[PDB]
């Protein structure tokens, strides 16, 4: 079986940079029988290159493929912000046909701090016995961010979950939600609800807070 090893596993570069993706085969791949696919998040793969170097119809010219034998290369001459994706190679010189494990390309941009928003639980949810408080960190870069919850200045642990968006295709930022889940009874025993955000685009951590009932 021809095993295809892709490298690097992850690659982060800014628009306009050249990106070079490698696919190395455990054995020779006959006749340049190697294809490359792009898979953007949530979408089907699309064919980029076949026969190692032939650009598929409709594919932008910045994508090109080269190589032979045991080493194949997908190049993006000048990255564009919509190029974040996982890129897969696939060989058809031998049976079984096999895919590489993929290279994830992430798009770098200049540092952007989050705007922070906080949403109390709705009266409709409180009627049913649970209370969700949501902290939104909107449109920031890089991805890494710390969110801490305080209830009457008491640090919370174990009762929050975070979710992060895929990169924005236009401006390359992320957004993040942190949801604090409390029983109704617990929510009503306390007054001040606060989300504290640490991010490298901020000079100092930012706290966003509200008082229950206001």
């Amino acid at each position: 079986e021809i095993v295809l090893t892709q490298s690097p596993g992850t690659l982060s570069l800014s628009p306009g940079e050249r990106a070079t993706l490698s696919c190395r085969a455990s054995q020779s791949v006959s006749s340049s029988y190697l294809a490359w696919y792009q898979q953007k998040p949530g979408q089907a793969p699309r064919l980029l290159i076949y026969g190692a170097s032939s650009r598929a119809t409709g594919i932008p010219d910045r994508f090109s493929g080269s190589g032979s034998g045991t080493d194949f290369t997908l190049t993006i001459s000048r990255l564009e912000p919509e190029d974040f994706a996982v890129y897969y190679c696939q060989q058809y010189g031998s049976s079984p046909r096999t895919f590489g494990q993929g290279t994830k390309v992430e798009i770098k941009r200049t540092v952007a701090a989050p705007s922070v928003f906080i949403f109390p639980p709705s009266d409709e949810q409180l009627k049913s016995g649970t209370a969700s408080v949501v902290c939104l960190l909107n449109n920031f870069y890089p991805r890494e961010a710390k969110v801490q919850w305080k209830v009457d200045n008491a640090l919370q642990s174990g009762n929050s979950q975070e979710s992060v968006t895929e990169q924005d295709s236009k401006d390359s930022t992320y957004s993040l939600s942190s949801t604090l889940t409390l029983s109704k009874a617990d929510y009503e025993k306390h007054k001040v609800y606060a989300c504290e955000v640490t991010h490298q685009g901020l000079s100092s951590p930012v706290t966003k807070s509200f008082n229950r009932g206001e």
């Binding site: 696939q90 949403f119 509200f210």
Partner: protein, 214 residues
């Protein structure tokens, strides 16, 4: 204008059977090599089944004897009839038109198959009302549904700019939750009505929730 349109996925009990379909346009299924490829959550592409133009069929070891790939010349459709399903079969399943026995040159959009003995449950939808504590941000909390996915639109698809629908998180209950947020001009709140439309196909649930300031 080749197209491949998939349907048939969703929730199925372990041990059950399920049939996927792929309706083709622009080419003749009967005269072409076609395949099913699946992708488990967070993993790479795994070929499952192929049918040659001449009718030969081949299967991955993990599905041989319990999956059948077939075609209906009359309806220009490809099928995958699955049996003895197990949790390891949970994946997005893609149909693809192959170029001969070589590479995958057109892909269907994918259909999620979730193999689980848990019952379907549609979501509750709560407002994240805009206040001064949220340019203004507002959203919808979509809580406690099973299985994935839900789809969220705003104002029936009229509002796209600035929307962030977060990936769902598995709560310890075993049910999913996510939020969908949008940033709108602060001036608008008084005038513009904002409605999130939440569709959950597995439960045949459609919820429209008006989000207005408190």
């Amino acid at each position: 204008q080749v197209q491949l349109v998939e349907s048939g996925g969703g929730l199925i009990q372990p041990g059950g059977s399920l049939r996927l379909s792929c309706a083709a346009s622009g080419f003749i299924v009967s005269s072409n090599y076609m395949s099913w490829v699946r992708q488990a959550p967070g993993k790479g592409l795994e070929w499952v089944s192929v049918i040659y133009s001449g009718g030969s069929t081949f299967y991955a070891d993990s599905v041989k004897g319990r999956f059948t790939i077939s075609r209906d010349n009359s309806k220009n459709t490809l099928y995958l009839q699955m049996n003895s399903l197990r949790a390891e079969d949970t994946a997005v399943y893609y149909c693809a038109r192959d170029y001969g026995d070589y590479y995958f040159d057109y892909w269907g959009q994918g259909t999620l198959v979730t193999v689980s003995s848990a019952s379907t449950k549609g979501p509750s939808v709560f407002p994240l009302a805009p206040s001064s504590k949220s340019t203004a941000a507002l959203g919808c909390l979509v809580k406690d549904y099973f299985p994935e996915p839900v789809t969220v639109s705003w104002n029936s698809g009229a509002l796209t700019s600035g929307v962030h629908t977060f990936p769902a998180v598995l709560q310890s209950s075993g049910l999913y939750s996510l939020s969908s947020v949008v940033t709108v001009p602060s001036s608008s709140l008084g005038t513009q009505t904002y409605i999130c439309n939440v569709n959950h196909k597995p439960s045949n649930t459609k919820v429209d929730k008006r989000v207005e300031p408190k």
